[model samples]
Target: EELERESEEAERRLQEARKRSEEARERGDLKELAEALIEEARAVQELARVACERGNSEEAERASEKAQRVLEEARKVSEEAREQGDDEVLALALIAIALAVLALAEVACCRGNSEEAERASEKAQRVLEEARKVSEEAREQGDDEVLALALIAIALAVLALAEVACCRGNKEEAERAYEDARRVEEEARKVKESAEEQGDSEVKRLAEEAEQLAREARRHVQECRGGWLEHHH
Candidate 1:
């Protein structure tokens, strides 16, 4: 009975700490939020200690389970937020490219056949969403979300610049942007393709494929950047 009381108190404190953590994250204080979680984890550890001291095996098990669940929930929210930010960057990139392509097609061909440009733009957006899903799944599995985002950003930048130069009917400027984007893409692709695919084959494969797409995007950027640059020079 004495052990039960102490265990319950610890559980309550843990819950309070967790609430504080959530509030901190809501306020955008990630550091404080992380600290709060660590404190809560420590509180949970103390609860386990009390349960053990009282020789209540069942209570200890329950406390541990509660702690683990909380742990996973907290991590999921953080990982999702990071992924969302990265996806936004990629979406912006794709939109930029689409607009550039549309501009160029309308200007050069005078056919106003913007469908191809629109399709490419839409495809980039679709892939970004897919990448976000894969990233969320890999979050708990030790996947490097930050690195993935960086790769996406690099690819998007390249594509956007390339498309802008190409669509503007500036072949020289287009080539410059295209070259830069492609170079970065190649580096990112090497990293993704080389990752070992053992337990999380689907996530790994998705990442690898994203890298390939980025490489293609880079190539496009280089072509446009070069064109734009040449026109100016």
Candidate 2:
């Protein structure tokens, strides 16, 4: 009962902070805007702490996820801070969005007619390389969110590689790709464990998803390999 109003208070603070960010952005003050965004994220962090106190893991997760996004925008637009941390934050979403693009490209490659495979595979490789850069950026940043996003990108790209190899009916090449994907997922597992102990729920969820995608990709690779013989996907 004592904590009943805490969530409400935290949420209202988040609302106010959001408006502050918008106003700062509207005024074209980059420095103040960065501060505003950081404040908004801090509000979300407070909400997450309140959620934890209230024992609502769902609310906590949602709040922390909001923080990760807000955190990125703050650093993305912040100037005069192009240090190593800033570089990683700027590169943060590069791999996350790249992962999405690669999957669609991989699908196009699989169903490609004429030169679709060639074009789509071409698309996949560039995006894959972009994600590789993100992985490098996050490796140095060592922020759990960036790290998780980086690891996920590698796993996804590896999955895409395996599928393209599978489509070519090169079982040997696909096998090795699958192996590497599994290994990357294991690395994701370590980051997740680290996040759970010291970081926030957002990183935990991101890394948890990394392993699942890899496993599912590997399993789907086998089905594609079997050619509708066993467990059609």
Candidate 3:
């Protein structure tokens, strides 16, 4: 009963956070208003984590997913703001590209090639590091959305790391990676939604591609987790 009550409270909070994020996005003050929305997103996710801890996985996942959606709305506003001379938004876009590359590497690993996976992991690590550097630059410029982008990149890297661990037969490491990927994928989905919101045909096309790759990463993690369970069984 306590868990249910807590979950309900979390749900209420998630709704409030979502409403605030949407309102901020609509206000179109990307740097100032949208900046506040990032914390709102985190607040929703934090509550989701609490609900998950209280034995309400469904509600927790729902809140987490909703938080990601809120982040997407923020990203859309930031993207448009960038197009309107908010140059710092460019860094967030670069992080997305870096994540895309990492996702591709995970895809390669899933196709049963350890060598390819290693190569991809190395490349992804390099690109991700560069993305983080850009993230820092965005911070100096007072762009909070870049922190959100950094989180997304970290999630993608975790997904890639899980693939590599699975390839190397490191079951324990792979399990950790799988768990982390699930968390990160929620964030990645937000970035994907951001790409979708842009009316540019090219952005839309790439967003579709990203969706496919993200799904592939999820499939790989699922398969890895399933195999681990089977082995234990």
Candidate 1 structure lDDT: 0.49
lDDT of 1 by residue, 1-233 (tens): 88678767777888887898789878976545645654565566566567556656565555446555544543454465456654333322332232222222222222222444344334334433444454454444554533454345345534544454455455554565555555555655554555553444443554564466566655554444343344222
Kindly list the per-residue Cα lDDT of model 2 for residues 1-233, writing each as its tens digit: 55657667767777886787688778865545555554564466466556656666566556645655663564356332344345443333344333433433343333433253344345445545665666666777666676676566566666656655566555664566567666777877887888889858898998887778678667766677454322323
**Model 2 misplaced stretches (Cα beyond 4 Å):** 1-92, 106-110, 227-233
Report the CA-based lDDT of candidate 3 relative to the real structure.
0.53
Best by TM-score: 2
Better candidate number, 1 or 3, judged by lDDT:
3
lDDT of 3 by residue, 68-162 (tens): 45545545654675578654454444443444444444344434557756765665565456555655665577544554455555555565665
Q: How many backbone collisions does model 1 have?
A: 37
TM-score of each: 0.34, 0.53, 0.40
When summed lDDT is taken over every stretch of 10 residues in candidate 2, the lowest stretch is: 105-114
Overall lDDT per candidate, in order of appearance? 0.49, 0.58, 0.53
